[PDB]
Design a protein around this nucleic acid. Structure first.
Ligand SMILES: [Zn+2]
Length: 19
DNA sequence: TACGCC
């Protein structure tokens, strides 16, 4: 539930600052 | 930034 890369919900990869 | 960054 959220971003897997950094750990910030609201995005996942595209939209992260990392991968 | 975020824009795939793989
Ligand atoms: Zn993220």
């Amino acid at each position: 539930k959220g971003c897997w890369k950094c750990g910030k919900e609201g995005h996942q990869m595209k939209d992260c600052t990392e991968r």
